[PDB]
Design a protein around this ligand. Structure first.
Ligand SMILES: [K+]
Ligand SMILES: [K+]
Ligand SMILES: [K+]
Ligand SMILES: [K+]
Lengths: 682, 682
């Protein structure tokens, strides 16, 4: 069900959560002064969520969240990334550089304190009410001096909610000694990673395992051999009971951004500039790359990862544009704004309408700039690799940047072909007068011939090939460098990119100010029960049910995938559909232990109507009694519009069944000590 | 449910059909001496099925069955193919050249008569028992002389069933004055034709309408303005009641070929030679074409139809190979043969085992020939367009064939690129000693360089370009013609193709003889109740239920598609997903008359567990009471293995809901006179 709720809103949502099946007492889920399930959720390394799953500090998160650490410890001698990793004793758990888990020790509503302090600011249009610097100076003041002395490992932060109509202060407890314990092989962790990105059904065992280490008294400590496992205040019990269609499910984690309070005009802008441009440009770029990768095996090797990273946000944009076109997103925001405008007229209060027209007017005014901005960023800055060629003892410094640019995955021939297709589109859309200066040479010097222009850049640039770089220096002429067509291209586009960004930047603030007023209206009118605050990287809960959906006429996706699905998808030639041979043998023997359903089918993943976004990677998924039933890892493309409007009949969180995580730990890892330390319940 | 049953087997299947829901009396469906529903089914123009749907001779069949006739009557002035056609009076119904509908007036079991007559044939290995000539001489003898004089429009034919263990005689009544009445626009008739070939869900309104005209007494007559509508003996009532999940459904029509009695060894051969070769070669050819069509808009125009025709059997082979790999087809045939072999040992009868080993031994022996045959047919004869370049007043005759070969859809550059890829694969697989002679020049004259060889063919052939043809004649040297590299290529490959076909041909007869014995065993052992005779282009019935299925883990396709599905798929830029504007407006207004379900959803198509194959295009689909509920038009790719082994959990007939046909006649055609003449019942 809809929304990413504040902990403070639990009481407002409690009735609704019970209607959907919640059996826990409010206090056991969250409370302000004691121990609750909230104390088992962590913010894992800056973005991801994770969860404490034993009384000795074991932490579960996704495989994609732990990927950097597993990769850091991997060698060709011990390739943990391909094979998995299972530490067979606590002493073999691997420390990690520059890692953190944060617990949210305390949350406090400080809206009154902040609005009082904001009264000193004389200027009515100051943006200090959202300034991270200013809010932290308020935080530090409220926490008193000596705070850090009196509270090992604690810190404070104030954040704005509801466009600056509400402020919370969080007290955070940060551990930096977090050690890798367990990871399945990549074939399991990344099963279908690219082809099935944003797809349900899904068959990925997307998990990894860490442990929080600390001092003898549980205080945060920097890494040392004398640190011991944290004995946490609360950890999750692990359910073996599974899930059924319609079962209650809930998630806590740290969603990043949403846009629930867009006006109709911002929706139109989001479609017609941001999404349309990303779609057109990435389709061009992807289409040339693909053609090259198909034609040449070595180019598939060099480019498949740049190809997949492009497709990631491309797919998201397609899905968002689909919702706009088919699910009524613009109309929903139109109705929200017209409701408040009728209401305000009746209250004799014109400021809500004026705020909506201010937003409208700013979006209208910035239109051509924004379009130019997106065209250049999607078309060139991201789209053409040689846009990031180097710009000027110092030759050795230049060589380093050249080497990074023309690295072992770079093909000058692919880059030229990509550039020709992207610039042809860019030049059709951007008129001569608004071009980055160097691109005026297409008309002026090459008579409209984009292939000739791009050919010339490579023919004469000292960065056009290694021998061209080697011959340049060798015999540096400084002199040649100042006329280099690549350098002048690169400089020229980044100069236009920069100047566009600077002229657009100021248009943000009027919109932000009006949103304060807009959201204040909405909340006065209808209250907060069905108007969640936009996500802002802070702890939130969401609740829903275990449920499939219909993607299109006469097709249904159910709520649960199985191991039978993995084997169906098995392809030993494609690295993303490789099946691990120990998991294959488990399947052949039906060696499922107590983790399969009564009918002998082994669950892999499930989906639910919870409301999640980027930042909910690794989030624990709880059942009606708060026991762990799964780990959140993706969402379906039909639901990406849900950052703007939740879609009950389409949006799903995609979740790894905790029974499958246990299976993999047991039968693939053989890591029995990790099951015995968890509290595994019926 | 399984099988394509003889009319004569209706009594054997009757109990089973009633268990599935049939409420008709046996006699009303089929009987030997009176009127039954069988008298409303026709064999439409040689291959398709159709059905009589009024007391004035209206005939329903598929749009793809009627396509040639609609296309024959179409002009740029009156393009009936794009717009549809609706004759607003009987006098405006269009006659068609060289068309037929055949009714099966009588069927008679003549096995005894034929086995008696076969006793004259002295040679035990004569293939006369399956010879169409010989069986027709028996037919004519049995029908007496003067048969055709005493029976206007009647003819007789004998056919072999069950590998020559059963013979039926049919008396056929043939009408040649069959006029086009009604056709939806192609956008409806062919909605998704290519992209959704062999796909369920499906959204195609695949129907057309004809009328049988005859003399004043209902006798067949050649076309004349004095002919009148046939007043048929039986026609189908049309149901408006629709279908629900699990409803009984049945079909009669004219299935072509099946291979129910394959041995395990024939299954392995079918996979590893016929299907593997068609898959590899067509994937190569398709992959070069696609690359070209993507690169050039004019090449997409010229080649999309050759591209789709290749994909048609390619897709079927993929689906068949999928069933072999995942659905146990080889094992089913192994078990059938080992059952009969244990049985025969117990009967003290070794001839069933010896028959199975004879088949085995023939398949083994022909293996390399068959492989060579398929390689050359898929790789070159079908795969390379210039293999069918011309082979030599007579220059004008040559020019005609050249013009057909190098027509407005032919690209020499595409042809060369295709040829290079196909010959590279062909030459890797076929050793020098077995090559068509001209292809030995790749090794011998061009040092392994297939691009140089193919380039030379085009450089020097008088068929390599129009100017090259024009310059040749002009100045014919005969002399140049006898050395022409294309002519010598063409001749060379057709010579090898021919010689392979001739050496393979004789291997068919031992297999056929052993199948007689093999099937005789199977039928002695288990009887005919669950062992249908292989399809042989004769009238058969099949029964099943209206039911969806699961294609893969966690996905379900339901039993019924709707108009909502058409609109979801709408793409005005792609000709196959164009939605007709009158159907679009109908949808927008929900102008569904009495044709939609109680919930306001308008059905388009449904699927059922009946057992169909090629030749069931246009087959009537009946409900429990024999009323028409739909028109069969395709089957799903998961079920194409069903020609060898029926798959209950996968194989479906794909059927146009008769309520959608009525909707289209009414709201798109405006052809009310066609509804008023039908008998439309609740
Ligand atoms: K994703
Ligand atoms: K987001
Ligand atoms: K088909
Ligand atoms: K067939």
């Amino acid at each position: 069900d809809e929304g990413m709720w504040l902990m403070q809103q639990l009481g407002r949502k409690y009735a609704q959560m019970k209607e959907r099946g919640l059996k826990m007492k409010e206090y056991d889920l969250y409370n302000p002064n004691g121990t609750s399930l909230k104390d088992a959720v962590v913010l894992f390394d800056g973005g991801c969520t994770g969860e404490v799953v034993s009384d000795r500090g074991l932490v579960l998160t996704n495989h994609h969240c732990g990927y950097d650490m597993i990769q850091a410890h991997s060698t060709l001698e011990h390739n943990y990334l391909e094979n998995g990793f299972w530490a067979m004793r606590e002493a073999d758990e691997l420390p990690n550089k520059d890692i953190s888990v944060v617990f949210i020790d305390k949350i406090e509503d400080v809206t009154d304190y902040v609005k009082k302090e904001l009264k000193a600011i004389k200027d009515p249009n100051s943006m200090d009410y959202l300034s991270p610097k200013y809010l932290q100076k308020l935080a530090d003041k409220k926490a008193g001096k000596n705070f850090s002395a009196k509270n090992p490992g604690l810190s404070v932060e104030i954040k704005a909610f509801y466009g600056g109509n509400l402020y919370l202060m969080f007290t955070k407890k940060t551990y930096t000694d977090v050690r890798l314990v367990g990871a399945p092989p990549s074939s399991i962790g990344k099963f279908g990673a690219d082809t099935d990105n944003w797809i349900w059904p899904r068959h990925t065992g997307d998990f990894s395992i860490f442990r929080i280490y600390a001092d003898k008294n549980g205080n945060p400590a920097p890494y040392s051999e004398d640190n011991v496992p944290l004995k946490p205040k609360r950890f999750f019990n692990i359910s073996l009971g599974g899930v059924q269609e319609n079962d209650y499910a809930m998630i806590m984690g740290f969603p990043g951004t949403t846009h629930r309070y867009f006006t109709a005009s911002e929706v139109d802008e989001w479609k017609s500039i941001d999404n349309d441009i990303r779609i057109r440009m990435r389709d061009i770029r992807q289409g040339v790359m693909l053609r090259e990768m198909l034609a040449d095996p070595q180019i598939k090797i060099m480019y498949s990862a740049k190809y997949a990273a492009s497709q990631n946000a491309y797919k998201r944009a397609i899905g968002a544009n689909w919702a706009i076109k088919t699910r009524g997103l613009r109309q929903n925001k139109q109705a929200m704004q017209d409701r408040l405008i009728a209401w305000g007229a009746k209250q004799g209060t014109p400021r809500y309408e004026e705020a909506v027209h201010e937003i409208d007017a700013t979006v209208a005014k910035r239109a051509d700039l924004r379009r130019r901005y997106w065209m250049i960023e999607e078309g060139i800055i991201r789209g053409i690799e040689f846009a990031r060629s180097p710009i000027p003892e110092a030759i050795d410094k230049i060589r380093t940047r050249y080497s990074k640019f023309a690295n072992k995955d770079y093909s000058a021939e692919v880059d030229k072909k990509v550039a020709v297709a992207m610039l042809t589109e860019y030049l059709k859309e951007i008129p001569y007068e608004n071009l980055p200066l160097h691109l005026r040479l297409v008309k002026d010097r090459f008579a409209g011939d984009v292939q000739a222009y791009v050919d010339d850049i490579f023919a004469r640039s000292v960065f056009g090939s290694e021998a061209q770089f080697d011959a340049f220096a060798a015999v540096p002429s400084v002199e040649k460098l100042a006329e280099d067509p690549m350098v002048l291209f690169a400089s020229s586009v980044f100069d236009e990119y920069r100047k566009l960004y600077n002229e657009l930047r100021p248009y943000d603030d009027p919109i932000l100010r009006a949103q304060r007023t807009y959201i204040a209206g909405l909340l006065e009118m209808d209250g907060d029960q069905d108007q969640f605050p936009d996500a802002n990287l802070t702890l939130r809960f969401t609740y829903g049910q275990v449920k499939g959906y219909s993607p299109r006429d006469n097709v249904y996706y159910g709520h649960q995938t199985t191991l039978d699905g993995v084997m169906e998808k098995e392809d030993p030639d494609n690295w993303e559909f490789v099946v691990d041979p120990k998991l294959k043998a488990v399947y052949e023997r039906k060696d499922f232990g107590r983790y399969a359903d009564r009918s002998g089918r082994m669950p892999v993943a499930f989906c639910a109507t919870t409301h999640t976004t980027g930042g909910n990677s690794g989030s624990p998924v709880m059942n009606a009694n708060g026991e762990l039933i799964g780990l959140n890892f993706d969402r379906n493309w039909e639901g990406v519009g849900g950052d703007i409007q939740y879609l009950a009949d389409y949006q799903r969180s995609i979740i790894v069944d905790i029974r499958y995580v246990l299976l993999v730990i047991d039968k693939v890892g053989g890591c029995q000590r990790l099951l015995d330390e968890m509290n595994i319940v019926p």
